[PDB]
């Protein structure tokens, strides 16, 4: 099925693959649709000589249906960023085998069992000993090398031009992250009646509304790096020794803190969900401490690794901090410490915004939704929401991730 | 004229005659009268001709593939003329009384035909040097700035429109790179392009390239210049980009335009008014000591910002239910919260404006492209004394701008200098 866009299912996919040498060659069929995400269709294909994943975008948001159109052109941006981020961090992104723009279809490496979505592992109370290492490396490489710390402004502008094409998905985010939680919307939902007052407070908080508008402006305006754009714990697949970032379909030239914040923010949601998963056998007290350690280490390793790349590449081609200006170790370290403190504050801000929108908005997270009892869920959700409102408003007071972790504990 | 060819006073006659949009404006198509054509471009980049016919007058501007003031050794795409013509039309639609009308654009020839801002219009910078007051200037410039910046921002654009507009203006990258070098980089290092009144400013230039706090601020502003698509900025809005009479104010030369930070325009303009203030003692004579004129400059600065602040807010209020998505009406949903976010936005905008303004002052004093305000002070030592006061003020302002809560406080600091 090739010449015009065709929505595929488990059996027409057979014919498409057979007609596509790049894909048929990779597996030489058992087909199962397994997409549990919000937007797209994903198929595991096996395979005489191998296996693969087929992802296809339809012209609307899958979790809503046809009343919410969304260009299938997002698949092009997903494939572009899987390749670009993959080039930079090949150990942490699934290889792309094939892209068909007409079909809005991507063929890519199947992340084989025992790979699971990280969010699920966090719900299950499983520790991932390489997670802080792998994720800090991924974020450092992808954000540093697509920033003006490495790009000259000619290539940066060329890349911005390209990614302005992903405006429809940017528009989805502008609505669901930066707008809906702060107003009345038929799309919003929360554990009710428990969080009714909580949701009203969010849409009546002036200081909160100021901060979200500033972050929304930065999202819409600031071409800082090629961000993944949806870097929550549902966008990471893991085993005890493998960490793979998937689903960069929301990618564009945006603020770095949006990725770091999405990821750290979702770890913070995991932390606040834990009490709702506690049992007689596992009270989650030690696991909660592990999550806090992973948050602290992810940021601290990221900071160290990002600066290491900057130091390694201080003598071009990036033009943001020209070496004959920032020309001794003292002034360079001074400007770096400033840059990283601002990046921490941006990250906490976007992280807090993502936490808020998960609790009162259209798209919730499994960490809380898998807590069956509404009352128990609401207690955990309220703790997370109170923390997130404080963080959004007060983040510039924090000098370190250690201070953020202390604040989480005092909540 | 199917291929690009540089025009001169003689060959332009033939170009006009082959071009109905031009010949008809001046009478060349129905009269045999000789056209009177004079090349008058005194700017840094392009060639500008005044054309006078029997029945009208016009200006022809042409870009060549290099920076005029440097010569062929500094290439610069002639495609800049496309961006100039685009922004003349776009800003002109928004502030029609303060931008010259475009009659003709020829992309191949990199050529614009536009309204001749006739005598006694002179460049504002020359009027400031001459000690001429312009009673309408704060009114006109504040309105010009509020209109051009508000209506091309996310307070008015939806993000689909904004992304489309950014895509287009990313093509003006070569001129952005010129500014990235000369404004944001060269003054803070050794460069063969840098120049200053020597030896008198040698220590001052060295201090700029040794000032860590200053280097931090310029890096953050450079990042904002390179990354932040806030509005369609003119991109070169100094006092040499404004032409004036007692009752007319016209903004010219938006060739550097792109989607950048609003403060870069406001700061370019106010920063050059501040340069003019600091140059005034250098132009003083026993007959006109410039003391009253200096106070006039300070009033115009204060009035320009204060009028801009309220007029920008007025457009925001007026378009609060309009298509802009930056501050959605059902979120910022009462008059009190809207004023609260507006006040913060405008404070940040003042700080951005003061930072870019200070950056432009610094680059005019130690960099490749100086201003007539100082260069027209004949005596080197006398010029350096005025230049130093300006530079010392600009360094303070770049570093300390966030302490200022009003333009009045900035004006007091200038008076304290
Ligand atoms: N390369 C892959 N290998 C294994 N499983 C995958 C792969 N890509 C996606 N999946 C599975 O498909 C689900 C949805 O994929 P995702 O790309 O997140 O789609 P959406 O864009 O709809 O969120 C994931 O939760 C995971 O279970
Ligand atoms: N529309 C106009 N009407 C009258 N004079 C003009 C007009 N446009 C330009 N000029 C004159 O040409 C000079 C240079 O024009 P400008 O557009 O600033 O060129 P540049 O891009 O080279 O700086 C101005 O200082 C002014 O004297
Ligand atoms: C209607 S919002 C859909 C959500 O799912 C995507 O993965 C993004 O997180 C988006 O906000
Ligand atoms: C080489 S710098 C030339 C200067 O003239 C233009 O008008 C801009 O101001 C530019 O910085
Ligand atoms: Cl999220
Ligand atoms: Cl200037
Ligand atoms: Mg997903
Ligand atoms: Mg997705
Ligand atoms: Mg000019
Ligand atoms: Mg000395
Ligand atoms: Mg010019």
Residue numbers in the entry:
A (entry chain B): 2 to 29, 37 to 419
B (entry chain A): 3 to 419
Could you give the paper's own sentences about this structure?
To promptly remove the toxic by-product MTA and to ensure sufficient supply of methionine and SAM, a methionine salvage pathway that recycles the methylthio moiety of MTA to methionine has evolved in almost all organisms. In this cycle MTA is first depurinated to 5-methylthioribose (MTR), and then phosphorylated to form MTR 1-phosphate (MTR 1-P). In bacteria and plant cells, two enzymes, MTA nucleosidase and MTR kinase, are required to convert MTA to MTR-1-P while in mammalian cells, MTA phosphorylase phosphorylizes MTA to MTR 1-P in a single step.
The structure of Arabidopsis thaliana MTR kinase co-crystallized with ATPγS and MTR has been determined at 1.9 Å resolution. The A. thaliana MTR kinase complex was prepared by co-crystallization with excess but equal amount of ATPγS and MTR, but surprisingly, ADP and MTR were found in the active site. The structure of A. thaliana MTR kinase has two subunits in the asymmetric unit related by a non-crystallographic 2-fold. The nucleotide binds in the cleft region between the two lobes of the protein. In the A. thaliana MTR kinase structure, two Mg(II) ions assist in the binding of the ADP. In A. thaliana MTR kinase, MTR is bound in the higher energy α-ribofuranose anomer with the substrate's O1 hydroxyl cis to the O2 and O3 hydroxyl groups. The O1 and O2 oxygens of MTR form hydrogen bonds (~2.7 Å) with the carboxyl oxygens of D238 of the strictly conserved HGD-motif; while the O2 and O3 oxygens of MTR forms heteronuclear hydrogen bonds (~2.9 Å) with the guanidium nitrogens of R365 of the strictly conserved twin arginine RR-motif. The second arginine R366 does not interact directly with MTR but may facilitate the release of the anionic product, MTR 1-P. In the A. thaliana enzyme, a lysine (K362) is located near the RR-motif, and to mitigate the electrostatic repulsion between these three positively charged residues, a chloride ion is found interacting with K362. The G-loop of A. thaliana MTR kinase has an extended conformation, with interactions formed between N46 and the O4 oxygen of MTR. A consequence of this extended G-loop in the Arabidopsis enzyme is that it shields the active site from solvent, a feature that more closely resembles a eukaryotic protein kinase active site than that of the B. subtilis MTR kinase.
